[PDB]
């Protein structure tokens, strides 16, 4: 069975990028603003069985906010995002938190400082204290480098299942088929070969 997770935070903080990374493995470099909310199921395999999060990825831009706190109703957990390269996004964390807890009074909440991969960090580790009095879990994360990318979901899963020893485990690997439409046409391959792979300077 499943849990409703609401993801909130300022526009541009990386909420959608973070979710997409988890959903497909990709890193979206473009900023395409979320309109209202986008709902995505997301399943993790754990030692206590599969856990499904229904992720309500909300809009951070005021202009695109849609139902706003209407999205929070019956949320069972939440992630509040900010961007460690933008002080204003941390300044706004108490506002997101206020709106969230007014609807969801006793849920586990992770606070995430995203974009820790960027060299010129503006919101320093020592500045980040809002979580303490609000009993929020905090993680430095990067959707780009994947630093701590699993931690918010692991912590929430542990809280929601009520098992501190819960761990992710390798999902079952069913045997794959054999597939030998004999004259199928794949000029598609030449396009793929002649389109450069991104981030060729990365380590990998």
């Amino acid at each position: 069975v499943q849990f409703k997770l609401v993801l909130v935070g300022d526009g541009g903080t990386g909420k959608t990028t973070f979710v997409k990374r988890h959903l497909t493995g990709e890193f979206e470099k473009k900023y395409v603003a979320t309109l209202g909310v986008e709902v995505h199921p997301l399943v993790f395999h754990t030692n206590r069985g599969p856990i499904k999060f229904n992720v309500w990825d909300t809009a951070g831009q005021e202009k695109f906010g849609g139902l706003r706190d209407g999205y929070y109703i019956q949320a069972q957990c939440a992630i509040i995002m900010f961007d460690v390269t933008s002080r204003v996004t941390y300044k706004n964390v108490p506002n997101w938190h206020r709106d969230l807890v007014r609807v969801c009074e006793n849920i586990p909440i992770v606070l995430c400082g995203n974009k820790v991969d960027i060299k010129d960090r503006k919101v320093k580790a020592k500045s980040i204290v809002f979580h303490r009095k609000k009993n929020l879990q905090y993680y430095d994360i990067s959707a780009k480098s994947n630093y701590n990318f699993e931690k918010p979901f692991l912590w929430l899963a542990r809280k929601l299942i009520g098992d501190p020893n819960l761990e992710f485990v390798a999902m079952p690997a069913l045997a794959p088929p054999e597939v030998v439409l004999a004259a199928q046409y794949e000029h598609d391959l030449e396009v793929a070969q002649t389109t450069a792979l991104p981030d060729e300077d990365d380590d990998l």
Partner: protein, 129 residues
Amino acid sequence: IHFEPVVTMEEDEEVLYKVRAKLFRFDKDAKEWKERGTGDCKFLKNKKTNKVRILMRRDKTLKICANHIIAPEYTLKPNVGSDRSWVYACTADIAEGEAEAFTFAIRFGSKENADKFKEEFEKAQEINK
């Protein structure tokens, strides 16, 4: 008087080869490569049938990002931007459940690793023949 004491589906496979890699899938519509996962790419040989598959799991989450037979008909081709990657068409990968066709690119830490991968890939293809 002895005191009464206090009260994956990869199990049947051999690991022929393991290498760290980043896997991409080509989006024809968007005309771009999209990362599918980073982690250990393993060549696994079934002990009963001797068939060799690629199985790759993402770091931390351990989620499968590639699961397909190393088909004899497949061919590794270079990508224009890289000397440490291979691109190939796959007609049946079940990483996301239902059998689906992909154009993959796999990139390695070095040209040497890419070259060793190609060697192992083609060996696996011969075993599968």
